[PDB]
Design a protein around this ligand. Sequence first.
Ligand SMILES: *[C@@H]1O[C@H](CO)[C@@H](O[C@@H]2O[C@H](CO)[C@@H](O[C@@H]3O[C@H](CO[C@H]4O[C@H](CO)[C@@H](O)[C@H](O)[C@@H]4O)[C@@H](O)[C@H](O[C@H]4O[C@H](CO)[C@@H](O)[C@H](O)[C@@H]4O)[C@@H]3O)[C@H](O)[C@H]2NC(C)=O)[C@H](O)[C@H]1NC(C)=O
Ligand SMILES: CC(=O)N[C@H]1[C@H]([C@H](O)[C@H](O)COC(C)=O)O[C@@](O[C@H](CO)[C@@H](O)[C@@H]2O[C@@](O)(C(=O)O)C[C@H](O)[C@H]2NC(C)=O)(C(=O)O)C[C@@H]1O
Ligand SMILES: *[C@@H]1O[C@H](CO)[C@@H](O[C@@H]2O[C@H](CO)[C@@H](O)[C@H](O)[C@H]2NC(C)=O)[C@H](O)[C@H]1NC(C)=O
Ligand SMILES: *[C@@H]1O[C@H](CO)[C@@H](O)[C@H](O)[C@H]1NC(C)=O
Ligand SMILES: *[C@@H]1O[C@H](CO)[C@@H](O)[C@H](O)[C@H]1NC(C)=O
Ligand SMILES: *[C@@H]1O[C@H](CO)[C@@H](O)[C@H](O)[C@H]1NC(C)=O
Ligand SMILES: *[C@@H]1O[C@H](CO)[C@@H](O)[C@H](O)[C@H]1NC(C)=O
Ligand SMILES: *[C@@H]1O[C@H](CO)[C@@H](O)[C@H](O)[C@H]1NC(C)=O
Ligand SMILES: *[C@@H]1O[C@H](CO)[C@@H](O)[C@H](O)[C@H]1NC(C)=O
Length: 268
Amino acid sequence: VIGDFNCTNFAINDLNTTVPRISEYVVDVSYGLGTYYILDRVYLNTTILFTGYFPKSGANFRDLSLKGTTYLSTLWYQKPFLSDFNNGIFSRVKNTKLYVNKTLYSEFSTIVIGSVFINNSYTIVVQPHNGVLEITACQYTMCEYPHTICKSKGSSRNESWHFDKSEPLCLFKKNFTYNVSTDWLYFHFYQERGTFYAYYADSGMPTTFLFSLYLGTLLSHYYVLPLTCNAISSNTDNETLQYWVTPLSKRQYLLKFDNRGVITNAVD
Ligand SMILES: *[C@@H]1O[C@H](CO)[C@@H](O[C@@H]2O[C@H](CO)[C@@H](O[C@@H]3O[C@H](CO[C@H]4O[C@H](CO)[C@@H](O)[C@H](O)[C@@H]4O)[C@@H](O)[C@H](O[C@H]4O[C@H](CO)[C@@H](O)[C@H](O)[C@@H]4O)[C@@H]3O)[C@H](O)[C@H]2NC(C)=O)[C@H](O)[C@H]1NC(C)=O
Ligand SMILES: CC(=O)N[C@H]1[C@H]([C@H](O)[C@H](O)COC(C)=O)O[C@@](O[C@H](CO)[C@@H](O)[C@@H]2O[C@@](O)(C(=O)O)C[C@H](O)[C@H]2NC(C)=O)(C(=O)O)C[C@@H]1O
Ligand SMILES: *[C@@H]1O[C@H](CO)[C@@H](O[C@@H]2O[C@H](CO)[C@@H](O)[C@H](O)[C@H]2NC(C)=O)[C@H](O)[C@H]1NC(C)=O
Ligand SMILES: *[C@@H]1O[C@H](CO)[C@@H](O)[C@H](O)[C@H]1NC(C)=O
Ligand SMILES: *[C@@H]1O[C@H](CO)[C@@H](O)[C@H](O)[C@H]1NC(C)=O
Ligand SMILES: *[C@@H]1O[C@H](CO)[C@@H](O)[C@H](O)[C@H]1NC(C)=O
Ligand SMILES: *[C@@H]1O[C@H](CO)[C@@H](O)[C@H](O)[C@H]1NC(C)=O
Ligand SMILES: *[C@@H]1O[C@H](CO)[C@@H](O)[C@H](O)[C@H]1NC(C)=O
Ligand SMILES: *[C@@H]1O[C@H](CO)[C@@H](O)[C@H](O)[C@H]1NC(C)=O
């Protein structure tokens, strides 16, 4: 289970439907993808050695995205999906592009990062809303079996991942835009000296700072929420979620900046 709150007992089972897929794709930082711009700094026409939380060059990813219909499995809320956060993660996220009429919509899995996932501890949540990325860090009363839904196509379950009837204490709450037409989003999430850091991009490029947050405590677990729809499967549209994740480590990178301040190259 994630949290401990009994939000539902509708259509829960114990079926071993899947395990996380391992990517054929591997981390290649030679053009800056898998690196980040350093905080609010601008570096112009230079190379720096910088020590930071980076993926290993040549590492695989685990796809932690889970697509449901009516049922959820209790085995989806355990190892290997419920994951130790350690130092942090780099993720590559497919923006799942859906059409209701001719109009386009963007869906992808929410990620939650936390420790015990109960309302005496802060949980960070990163969730898309069709071109808006909502991010929060709150004392959420997380469900036992949390999940999100398609807003675009229908869902035979309601959205249910926390049960707070009035808004919990939040250290952070902010929204960021992303290009709805992109094929991929990328994120870095890490912790250093009790401070959390987040970065994103909506292109094959170095990730840009979202926010940083002092927690004092260690985050210890992260989990990628199941998403339920009457869509996004082989018998209806052949479309899929993908939420690829690879671990970070304290690591030294060369970063090359051009005269505009764009990272053009990097080395592990
Ligand atoms: C912060 O997070 C915590 C932890 O999740 C929340 O605390 C839980 O809150 C819920 C909702 O109030 C509590 O659930 C309720 O517990 C009552 C007592 O349980 C005992 O008695 C029942 C029989 O009545 C036994 O079966 C059980 O084993 C216990 O011995 C129940 O009486 C309540 O029953 C109602 O709900 C159930 C389920 O929907 C129905 O079947 C019943 O008919 C009835 O409608 C209910 O189960 C839970 O116990 C709390 N846990 C703890 C550890 O405190 C906090 O609420 C949250 N705080 C904030 C600010 O959000
Ligand atoms: C994490 C995971 O394993 N995810 C897969 C999912 C689950 O294994 C399945 O939900 C059972 O999970 C549990 C916990 O029991 O199966 C999916 O495929 C289904 C067949 O397996 C799909 O074709 C569905 O077939 C139906 O017969 C039915 O009800 O399952 C009719 C329904 O309308 C139709 N769904 C549509 C059209 O979206 C799905 O989607 O649900 C593809 C997902 O990648
Ligand atoms: C961040 O984005 C979300 C999603 O668009 C906003 O949530 C909406 O807020 C209004 C407030 O009146 C509600 O009526 C809607 O029902 C909410 N939508 C959803 C899907 O929850 C949120 O207001 C935005 N801003 C901030 C600072 O969180
Ligand atoms: C969860 O709540 C439902 C609805 O009240 C109840 O039927 C079910 O027995 C509960 N299960 C547990 C494990 O508390
Ligand atoms: C689930 O199925 C996979 C594939 O057969 C297997 O590797 C795994 O050990 C099974 N059990 C669990 C609890 O994951
Ligand atoms: C960029 O740096 C190189 C090496 O020092 C130098 O030759 C070049 O003139 C610089 N250009 C600008 C625009 O700073
Ligand atoms: C979803 O929400 C609606 C409206 O509150 C409710 O009627 C329904 O019972 C809920 N649950 C499911 C599984 O649809
Ligand atoms: C949005 O994404 C598409 C596909 O990558 C790209 O062609 C388009 O130029 C992008 N537009 C903006 C405003 O970023
Ligand atoms: C999904 O793709 C397979 C392979 O191309 C095809 O056989 C099947 O008919 C497709 N189904 C849908 C709903 O597109």
